[PDB]
Subunit: 205 residues, 8 copies
């Protein structure tokens, strides 16, 4: 596996002239107002990944933000509700063309109640992702090799999952449901940033 | 107050050449697959209401459905998540231009945790709605006068609430949030009809 | 209202040559193995009631038990799961032709979650039953007038409820469901006596 | 072990001229209105099994339904409350002669609170069933060998369990209790289909 | 009603040459190690009461302690588990001849789940005790008249309750159960003082 | 009662040359990052109050902030954990000489579990505060008379409570405990602003 | 290890002329009114055990009951609350000289919250008891060797535990507390048989 | 590793002329009023430890208390809320210069919810601490070698953790927050001793 590690931003977009890009983030925690973005990982689906270390207080990443803003490229996330929130909070741009594997799983893998990425990758691809490094110091000046490999493992498989989930959504005739959910997901993330992160806005109570 | 009671459908749309119509329903319960639609109430905001008794097994109401399908007329609901579901299940047409006072309350009345219609009407208008008839036999062949007055009371005030809530949403700069929520609300109702009524599709667990 | 109070048993069955009899009990508590049967109340539906005081250790009541065993007479209960259990535990005979207003309410009053006798009588008949004496010393040698009137009030209305509930069950096409539930109710009561009173025998867990 | 895999239906009933047949199903989930029947497995108890793949939208399976409707053949299930519901929803025929190993376990294995099939098979027969494939894509056009073996393992042992449970029910004198529970089980399943799947119809609250 | 208010101790025992004395306490709270004893109330059952104000840091009350230690006099409490604990903690003497109306209620008033003193007095005697002053500053140098009347009301009726409860215990044949419970109650209070106040020492977990 | 209503700030500090000032706030809700400060109320303890309407986006209030920063003047709050947070978030100055009636109540009113301002005022002073206006639109351009009177009622009594609580703290020898709690309270509020509002920082879990 | 298996009763008491006997039971479940006594195991502490199979409906075991009734012999149990209940229910004799290792553990092993027999034996003696057979069919006509060895393992170590716990109770000065708890334990078991098995008779609620 | 075991007290302070000392305790349980201090462990950070056995009823340890009272030496704890309480309760001196690794973890390891010492040591240092002996008889006259090694393992690493946590607190700019928390920690422990151990003194409820 090829993992290219960068400081601050991509050098250029030569490797990301594609129709869909897998995106994930790492942070110091679950609360975007307290816990800063530390790492962004990207993959074109070609079996390689880019891992971009974000500096404390960094407000801009022009090449990355160009990728995030381009409406002709679908951004694939797992539980994008969080990643969209932290990305918009950090760089000020909210992506609006997204696919979320957690929503897709909840709309298709109706035979289980376990929708985490580890379980999805295990069941659909028989690939074992080890989550031991998920809780680690992502703000370290130098990431360990184990950290880098874990960070890359989170984007290496999202394209294959998207392909399978699109097949399942077509088979079970839920394409318009998923499309509407993905269309609303950026506003769910914005609501999270504004202060309703603990509130189901559509619930009766 | 003028309450016109009809059987099956409106006679015509002469009274509903307006930009927004208040809509509510009554049913035999909270589960659209088990509990049939029994009454539909409408108001143009002029202080009068129409109460339409729906027969068992009735599949069509052409004038009402014409109103519900007209994209130039905003349908105002309180907790439209339910009403949209039961209306689409009964007549096969899902409205797509809606305003929901419960979502608006949750986005604006942040100083309270009580978002029911009774509390909203009491606080915003100092009008006391009595909910005693909410749990009654709405499938009766002949509705009582108390039932008819209660049913009318649920639509008589939605226009005034919409006006106030639009003022609050503009004041607190949440118009685009509310618009996106209202745009997603019909798909939330469809998800309810399809079997995810007990599932927050965006939650981590 | 006419309330005839008896010691031990009915003098005869001259007043109970009817197709359905309303039955209720009072006890020292909810656990038949600890809490003895103290009072049995009966009504033919003619606006009068019989209140039979049961002595401590009494094992037999031949006229009452003749009524309870007669398969040509439907026994009407409210929450018969309990009354059947305590009656079978006390006299050794389990009725097998029953109607239960709580099951009927749960199968028909789907628009509410309150299925107690007070709420049913209030909604369906606009009659106010006062439950203040429900928790009182039913084992007293001499019952107070308030106790006797309360005990009679629990059977005076069950016929009218049965008539209305049968109308609702026919209207909503649930007659065979109710019939099967009533057929199983005596075995649910037997299961209670045998030790599964806290167990839903049909639940997954 | 011999596992015969069929498409749509049994070719004939030559192998099922027997007094009792073990039956199980697999679906896309726990909610019959959303989650379609995908596989039906059968065994005569001779150590072989039939696994029948059900197509999307299939409404009829005449040989299977003939077996399911024949009152002279007892259908053995584990947690038949679910299987009866999905079978009746799919093919329109509700079996009325059934035996359920979960009810039997709850009536006899009173020394444990674990009544799942894995635990029952482990304790009563010392046979280890692996449930890893229980949550898998049962709607796949081609089932994997592991899926087929898992599906067969669920019916291969129900006859032996029925024999042991009948011995236990006779020993502890609960035969009439079990018989009444099995008689009510199809109506419990019907109640599930009608919308009371989350309601204990006999509970006080 | 006659209420004699004393500072520190009774002047003598001339009024307490009796077979049973009603006893209650008031404190600054539910935790004897933090919340000091402030008032002790006594009654002989003759319709009069003594209310003894206890000073901060007071370690001795010889006449009161003589009464508390005399094994020929039954001390009547309501929820004596607490009063015994605070009395033993304050004066160093644990009474060993006691009657508790809460234990008696739980052993006899099996038809209710409300065993507080207010409910018992209301049901058994039709006397309304007002608990408004229960949460008040009992450490005040001068108690208000309302406080004094409330404090007296808690002992004025315990003799009558004891008489009725003894009748009920005899009637239901639970005398030896109650006697054993009362014999253990002082050790339950000691266990509370030693640090097991939140632990059911006899529970499995 | 004299209530002086101001826009933006006090005109001067001529009325607040005192040793302690009662302070309270009103907001659009419980979350300082979402819900802006709308009203600040002050009282010198002389039976009059000042009610200062804060404009949207207002960042400065020099006379008020001078009062809040003056270390020679004790700021009295009820549940100052919140008020300190919203004041520091709005004007950028955290008071460091405070008294909190909720902490004082929890350290002295150990005989009750109700520590709200209404209950404290009722018990200690026999004054009835009506909280009906607590949940109202505090951002209105013009406050109603009822709103103004409610806002003033929250500061009119804090001096008298402080006097009584200081007496109780001296009597029960908890002065150094209270002093340390008040010294830590501003940092508890800062922790709230930083993102630990839902976390007991000292708990084991 | 020597395990003597008997049918119905001990042949004689020649091996049980001792000051303390370890006692345990096995049943069909936790509810003495439903779940019959199946096995009784005894040990004198000499490293051997007696396992007595109890027949269905057996009402008498004269040698065993002689042992159970002899006040000069302490009966050692683990969680005797249950064993005393089932023994008294089966043979009609309640032991009144008992020692319970669960009460002793709760009074001495204050540094842990795990008081089960497995954990106690592991910690105090470094002996590993395997509980796999705890949930098995104890009513089988012929017990398996594994069942017999498990049943014997439950009494083989109670003497050593009693010795250690008596040392701990003396060291921490809790002997009179334990003695009072053991004195009350038979009445706690009687209360269980009478119907208060789910009630803490000493709790406030 | 060098572990020096002492009885009662250190012989002298020759090894503890340092700027910071790691401190931990072992007790008979979590409740200082019931569960006595049994062991105190200390380390200077040089890879050696002192383990001091405390006798029952011991009130003084002059050299240890001299160390605990010296304001020029920072005492490092893990969850010092407990250790401070038990130390002050036993020897009457409350340390006032402390560092707590649990507070530091909650202020810095925001990417996890597991703040126990085992997890911290595993993540930050890759050192595996085995907690098997945590629940053991610490009051034994002679500690086992395994107990001594476990007790030493709890102080051997606190200096390294303090160094890392100080780096993290500086990096994330939370030094003044941590300092204020550490300043309040002794009063939190005092509040625990006084009776508020189960109360969040700053919570609204």
């Amino acid at each position: 596996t090829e993992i290219r590690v960068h400081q601050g931003d991509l050098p250029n977009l030569d490797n990301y002239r594609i129709d869909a890009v897998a995106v994930d983030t790492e942070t110091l925690g679950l609360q975007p107002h307290r816990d800063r973005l530390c790492v962004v990982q990207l993959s074109s689906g070609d079996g390689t990944a880019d891992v971009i270390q974000i500096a404390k207080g960094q407000k801009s990443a022009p090449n990355l933000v160009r990728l995030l803003s381009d409406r002709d490229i679908t951004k694939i996330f797992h539980f994008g509700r969080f990643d969209l929130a932290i990305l918009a909070h950090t760089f000020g741009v909210m992506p609006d063309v997204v696919f979320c594997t957690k929503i897709a799983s909840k709309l298709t893998r109706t035979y289980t109640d376990r929708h985490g990425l580890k379980e999805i990758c295990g069941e659909l691809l028989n690939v074992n992702i080890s989550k031991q490094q998920q809780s680690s110091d992502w703000a370290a000046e130098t990431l360990s090799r184990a950290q880098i490999e874990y960070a890359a493992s989170d984007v290496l498989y999202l394209h294959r999952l998207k392909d399978i989930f699109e097949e399942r959504l077509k088979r079970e005739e839920r394409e318009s449901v998923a499309k509407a959910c993905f269309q609303f997901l950026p506003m769910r993330a914005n609501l999270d940033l504004l202060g309703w992160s603990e509130i189901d806005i559509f619930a009766h109570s």
